[PDB]
Design a binder for this molecule. Structure first.
Ligand SMILES: CCN1C(=O)CSC1=S
Length: 209
């Protein structure tokens, strides 16, 4: 059972802008996703202070970066609070609507794409480098879901039958054919050092075989 949904018009417009605009400083996508993971980690950590049983699905709070040249994917894994089915279909898009409006206004007034995270919609910068994004997520209060979109106005959600994650989010970037530099260890190290050096959680960059 795979459900297909339309993005709101404003969100679709934003992802077309990201895909079609000429903008060479694509590497900021990593900083935005790592920032999202850190936010999700902060949330489950704060919740656990008043309800320790929220860490029963995994006490480790961390971020893993996993390149795979064979599949041509870069995966950003966190053990943060995760997302419910309602988040995937409703809540994230509701919030993103006003952040997109503000970002798009700032752009025509002289801002640039690197400022996207100041507007709360840094996730869609993934389409600077990815032709398709698959998101696996598990929240304590819901089932494990796979979200997916190749842009083009629509996204899918299904119950995920793969390996159980426990709790957290896995963002799988299926990289565009000319963006495989973001599979290289030295390139990923450089970007993390430059843009994410003070994240308050361990970032482990896996190496490939
Ligand atoms: C975690 C992945 N993601 C967002 O951050 C906004 S929509 C979506 S799926």
């Amino acid at each position: 059972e795979v459900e297909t949904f339309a993005f709101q018009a404003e969100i679709a417009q934003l992802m077309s802008l990201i895909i079609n605009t000429f903008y060479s400083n694509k590497e900021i996508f990593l900083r935005e996703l790592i920032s999202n993971s850190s936010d999700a980690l902060d949330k489950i950590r704060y919740e656990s202070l008043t309800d320790p049983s929220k860490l029963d699905s995994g006490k480790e709070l961390h971020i893993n970066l996993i390149p795979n040249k064979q599949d041509r994917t870069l995966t950003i894994v966190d053990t943060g609070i995760g997302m419910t089915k309602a988040d995937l279909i409703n809540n994230l898009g509701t919030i993103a609507k006003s952040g997109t409006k503000a970002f798009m206004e700032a752009l025509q007034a002289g801002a640039d794409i690197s400022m996207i995270g100041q507007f709360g919609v840094g996730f869609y910068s993934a389409y600077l480098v990815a032709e398709k994004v698959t998101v696996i997520t598990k929240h304590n209060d819901d089932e494990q879901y796979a979200w997916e979109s190749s842009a083009g106005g629509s996204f899918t959600v299904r119950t995920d039958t793969g390996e159980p994650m426990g709790r957290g989010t896995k963002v799988i970037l299926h990289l565009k054919e000319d963006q495989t530099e973001y599979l290289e260890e030295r390139r990923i190290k450089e970007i993390v050092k430059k843009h994410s050096q003070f994240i308050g959680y361990p970032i482990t960059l896996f190496v490939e075989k």
